[PDB]
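#dry-run=false #mode=assembly
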Amino acid sequence: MEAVKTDRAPAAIGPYAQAVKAGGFVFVSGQIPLAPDGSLVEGDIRVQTERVMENLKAVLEAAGSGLSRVVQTTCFLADMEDFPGFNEVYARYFTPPYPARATVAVKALPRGVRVEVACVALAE
Amino acid sequence: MEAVKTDRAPAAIGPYAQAVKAGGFVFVSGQIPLAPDGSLVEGDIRVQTERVMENLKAVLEAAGSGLSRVVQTTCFLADMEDFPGFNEVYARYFTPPYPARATVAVKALPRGVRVEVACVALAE
Amino acid sequence: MEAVKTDRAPAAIGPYAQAVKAGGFVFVSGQIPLAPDGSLVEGDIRVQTERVMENLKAVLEAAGSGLSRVVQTTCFLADMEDFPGFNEVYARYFTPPYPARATVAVKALPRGVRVEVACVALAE
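#status=ok
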């Protein structure tokens, strides 16, 4: 069990790690639209989702894994209306065999953001 | 890694797999009230939860696993008033040792459905 | 695959187990502010979050692990405003390397509660 640390994604300031390596898997914390320097990337679903995706990418690689190794993702949206644009961008970063997915619209997300994505992947 | 593909459950049309086998586990995508052909199955929770259950059964089986091997489920409902009905049907398909569970009411689910359930089971 | 059972945490009355030991991990059910006897602990986030933590703790120990072995947690809040209080009490129980975390605000939780935390830990 070892924490994943990288300045390529938003720093984990608080009681959590960007990701954890354990038992053969990598557990990545929910990711939101924040550039590495903490700033809040704003825009429609497409813009925010892209930032979310890059963070995942950064966290996974830093852990010696990657997007192609993600087996499960949990996607929370602020509004189901935003699904299409979210899916279109989501489609860009994942590859066959795609990960198992669960998507739901929640009441609200950290910092009024529109999308948060957490996932689990295989390590190496 | 291996994507699970069965026609006895809604086909995964998009950037995801009905489920993926990896690290000794099976990660099943959130299942909703849809018959294998893709059609919406309407009705109260019981009718919908039964469809979701059948879908899980089909996917898990195709992965060379099953309902008795499920260790965790993430249950999302569109309204907590529906828990009683949901739980009733749910108890039919699971067996001791029962899966660990987390249940919540969310703002909205895919295609206006009222129940979505994702799970993790042991591969055989 | 083995279910975890303990009196130091709300008994699992239903189709689920407080936790399941499988494939090297411990899958813990979503815990809410219920004292072991089944009564509801009421108050602000701090008071309820604390019961939840104590619950998680009792279950993980009964499983053969602990709060220090937790790699992932899914935290559901009823109101996002409650986050700070929840985070302040969350930080008391977890230790570096902290778990991967995903936090979101949902429409409602079991029994009108304001916090539900589920997690996955390494078995010892």
